[PDB]
Write a protein that binds this ligand. Structure first.
Ligand SMILES: OC[C@H]1O[C@@H](S[C@@H]2O[C@H](CO)[C@H](O)[C@H](n3cc(-c4cccc(F)c4)nn3)[C@H]2O)[C@H](O)[C@@H](n2cc(-c3cccc(F)c3)nn2)[C@H]1O
Ligand SMILES: [Cl-]
Length: 137
């Protein structure tokens, strides 16, 4: 699975939909990014950064009209350089549920209301990708 990787989401994102991304973080990693896309806009951007002011942080944002909105930041960082990870993204009708390494990490309230229109997920950054699928729960 070649990074940058695109995972098509036919029908779009829909409540009860569970996205599982398995992979490994590369050594001396700087950044990782998941991008739930609605055209040229990014509905949900999940962005672990490993060195921002000598600190590790997860930045979440929405890009509407080539402009990034309000940053949602999480200090809780479950990723490590040269270590495998499991990211699980559950779609609910009120928020995105993000779990990493089988423990809930963050919630991301839907800025884009047209969930049937979010038809693509992009996996990019400093990672070796093992598995990318989705199913209903
Ligand atoms: O919003 C998310 C976007 O962020 C900008 S960096 C952004 O730059 C702005 C410049 O005006 C501000 O500085 C903003 N900022 C910093 C703080 C702060 C700083 C410290 C502490 C603290 F409290 C607060 N508050 N606001 C920065 O986060 C990235 O380029 C962008 N992006 C990344 C990628 C990308 C491409 C390929 C791979 C990949 F992983 C990511 N492709 N687009 C995306 O991640
Ligand atoms: Cl970045």
């Amino acid at each position: 699975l070649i990074v940058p990787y695109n995972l098509p989401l036919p029908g779009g994102v829909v409540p009860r939909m569970l996205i599982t991304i398995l992979g490994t973080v590369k050594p001396n990693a700087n950044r990782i990014a998941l991008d739930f896309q609605r055209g040229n806009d990014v509905a949900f951007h999940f962005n672990p950064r490993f060195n921002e002011n000598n600190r590790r942080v997860i930045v979440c944002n929405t890009k509407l009209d080539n402009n990034w909105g309000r940053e949602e930041r999480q200090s809780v960082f479950p990723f490590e350089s040269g270590k495998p990870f499991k990211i699980q993204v559950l779609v609910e009708p009120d928020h995105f549920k993000v779990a990493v390494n089988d423990a809930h990490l963050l919630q991301y309230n839907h800025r884009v209301k047209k969930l049937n229109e979010i038809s693509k997920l992009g996996i990019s950054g400093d990672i070796d990708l093992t598995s990318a699928s989705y199913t209903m729960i």
